């Protein structure tokens, strides 16, 4: 509902540290791995498996075990500068092509 942050500055700098993001999950019952989530820049909101990226502020939910944090981050928040710093544009293009092709 809010626009995604495409600047090089994090929307939520309180969640910029991996350890800070890790704390937000607590006991995590969900199919997708919390450390893998925190590495993809995601922190938990405390309602179901709702996560937000610390940098773009981009929010995701209803994590199937087939869904990957970095892939979902790229699918839904392609303009995220954190995503770009960590993964690079070669990775990001693959994800886009793969999912844009996945539709068939």
Ligand X SMILES: C[C@@H]1CN(CC(=O)N2CC(C)(C)c3ncc(Cc4ccccc4)cc32)[C@@H](C(=O)N2CCOCC2)C[NH2+]1
8-67 binders of Zn ion (CB under 5 A): 53, 55-56, 58
**Rule CB under 5 A: is residue 80 a binding residue for Zn ion?**
yes
Residues 57-92 as b or e (16 or more Cβ within 10 Å = b): bbbbeebeeeebbbbbbbbebbebebbbeebeeeeb
49-78 binders of ligand X (CB under 6 A): 50, 52, 59-64, 67, 72, 76
Which residue number, 33 or 84, has a Cβ lying nearer to Zn ion? 84
Supply 70's token pair: 């970095």
Nearest to 52 by CA among 101, 95, 10, 97: 10
Return residues touching Zn ion (CB under 5 A): 53, 55-56, 58, 77, 80, 82
By the criterion CB under 6 A, which residues form the site for ligand X? Answer: 45, 50, 52, 59-64, 67, 72, 76
């Amino acid at each position: 509902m809010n626009f995604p942050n495409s600047t090089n500055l994090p929307r939520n700098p309180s969640m910029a540290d991996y350890e800070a993001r890790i704390f937000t999950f607590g006991t995590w019952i969900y199919s997708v791995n919390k450390e893998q989530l925190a590495r993809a820049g995601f922190y938990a909101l405390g309602e179901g498996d709702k996560v937000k990226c610390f940098h773009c502020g981009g929010g995701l939910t209803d994590w199937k075990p087939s869904e990957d944090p970095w892939e979902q981050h790229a699918k839904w928040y392609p303009g995220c500068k954190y995503l770009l710093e960590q993964k690079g544009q070669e990775y990001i293009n693959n994800i886009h092509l793969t999912h844009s092709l996945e539709e068939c």
